[PDB]
Design a protein around this ligand. Structure first.
Ligand SMILES: NC(=O)[C@H]1CCCN(C(=O)[C@H]2CCc3cccc(Br)c32)C1
Ligand SMILES: [Zn+2]
Length: 139
């Protein structure tokens, strides 16, 4: 679990969005596993606007942060789950690192700010949904 709070927006994994997120919907994209809802309170976070390919992510299944080298956002095939059929997920970045289901929503940060959130994983891999291209989060 986890979210990004920036301005009057909450950014979550689309597959973990709540009834309240859907009732306050701003934008969602199944192909990216992202959903953004509106908030009444002003948010705690800064979004990176950069091309970093290194950063640090929070891994809830270890209660620890780990450094990572990650690929640029791309279209990656993701196996079927209870939430989606087998499909290509866009704007996804992969890295070598521990992840389990339950780790979705953990933040990836570089020195410039928040880069994205955990969205996929596998045997020693972790995948992050990029948010750096969503320029409107800042206004
Ligand atoms: N973005 C998606 O389609 C997600 C939906 C939930 C499921 N998903 C995953 O990758 C999960 C299932 C297998 C596994 C192993 C280690 C970490 C994670 Br996170 C996962 C894809
Ligand atoms: Zn950066």
């Amino acid at each position: 679990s986890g979210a990004i709070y920036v301005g009057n927006y909450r950014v979550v994994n689309r597959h973990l969005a709540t009834h309240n997120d859907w009732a306050n919907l701003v934008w969602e994209d199944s192909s990216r596993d992202l959903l953004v809802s509106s908030t009444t309170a002003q948010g705690c976070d800064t979004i990176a606007r950069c091309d970093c390919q290194t950063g640090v992510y929070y891994c809830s299944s270890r209660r620890k942060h780990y450094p990572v080298s990650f690929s640029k956002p791309s279209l990656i095939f993701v196996e079927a789950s209870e939430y989606y059929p087998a499909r290509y997920q866009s704007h996804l970045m992969l890295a070598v690192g521990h992840s389990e289901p339950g780790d979705c929503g953990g933040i990836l940060r570089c020195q410039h700010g928040v880069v994205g959130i955990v969205s996929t994983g596998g045997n020693g891999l972790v995948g992050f949904a990029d948010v750096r291209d969503l320029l409107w989060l800042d206004e």
